[PDB]
Amino acid sequence: QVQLVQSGAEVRKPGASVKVSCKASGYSFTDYYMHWVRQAPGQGLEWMGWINPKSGGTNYAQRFQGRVTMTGDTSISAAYMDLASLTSDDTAVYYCVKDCGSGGLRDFWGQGTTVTVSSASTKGPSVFPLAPSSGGTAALGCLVKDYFPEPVTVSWNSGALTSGVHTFPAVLQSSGLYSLSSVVTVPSSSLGTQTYICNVNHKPSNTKVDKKVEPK
């Protein structure tokens, strides 16, 4: 019914600022409230503030007062969140949320903008095999190591192989680079017949890798 289209993922160095946009369409363009809510890794939702794009009135959570500025352009139904003096505590998904009237659904959410606060440079991953070596079933996989920023996607056999696939959450290493593992369990009897290729995509570095994984 309503789409809140957010700007794309951002990387910032510590001490820099970030400005995220949210553009509404479908219902209204003036007198509603737009809220900003974020979620940092391993943390709960955190309410940041609201803006009334018609009046320009704002109200910020106490912990962001003096560091966040919300603005609105009623003419393009747009709201902006500008956050200064960034630290790694500001690495988060940032969601815009429209407050609706009575009659229908009470709210609509954007899909989120990921902001990563880090001194790391953009780097595509290395892809290493986890080669099959257990009761009729074999495990194999791909280790996707040393990339920045998130995310990477992994599929198997161009997305034709879904049964028994587990792609783990990425871990952040002390280097400031991420690592991710994807595994699949298959019948041991299939290791001779069937080919297994992990399809890795790191869009931030324009890095796509296909790795065939076979017994050593």
Next chain:
Amino acid sequence: DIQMTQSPDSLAVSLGERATINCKSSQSVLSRANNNYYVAWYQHKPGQPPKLLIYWASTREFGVPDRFSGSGSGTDFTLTINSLQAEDVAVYYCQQYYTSRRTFGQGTKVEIKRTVAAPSVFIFPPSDEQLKSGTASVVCLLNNFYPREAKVQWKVDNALQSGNSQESVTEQDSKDSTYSLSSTLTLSKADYEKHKVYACEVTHQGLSSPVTKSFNRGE
């Protein structure tokens, strides 16, 4: 500001049973003008933004199944899920919107409680491809276990490793209600080529005693 304190942090409930999630406001969130409690409940799942379930403490949002209900009594708020379904596995948040500034509770993770299931354990040496680069990653996979609590202990020539591994865990599988976990031991190529016996020892309540998977470097 008004604080919202949720409990419990984690809830495991059998399929078709009742889940109860609690939230305590630090102050009244009741309007004297309309006698509504300014409390909302949200459901947050992977691949979708947070979803409003309940507003004014007890009013269900359009399109929310009737197995979701909310109650408010002074500073105590409850979200009840009757007949819990696998699709209900999520983090639930309360929120107050009584004041101009809003506050979320810290969240409650709801999972399906299934019977205990021991992990299947697999170990992977570093690839020869990786060894060219001066780092070695040794991987241990724990597949399809319940509950989520598991201990992985790496050993290298029987020395217990601490601080040089990282792990991560899948979301609960919708069909079998299990978890999987991968642990990665990172060490220098020099250390890898110096030592011989690489072991992943797994402790879990589905096992009588810890399970060890090991390899000898070069075999």
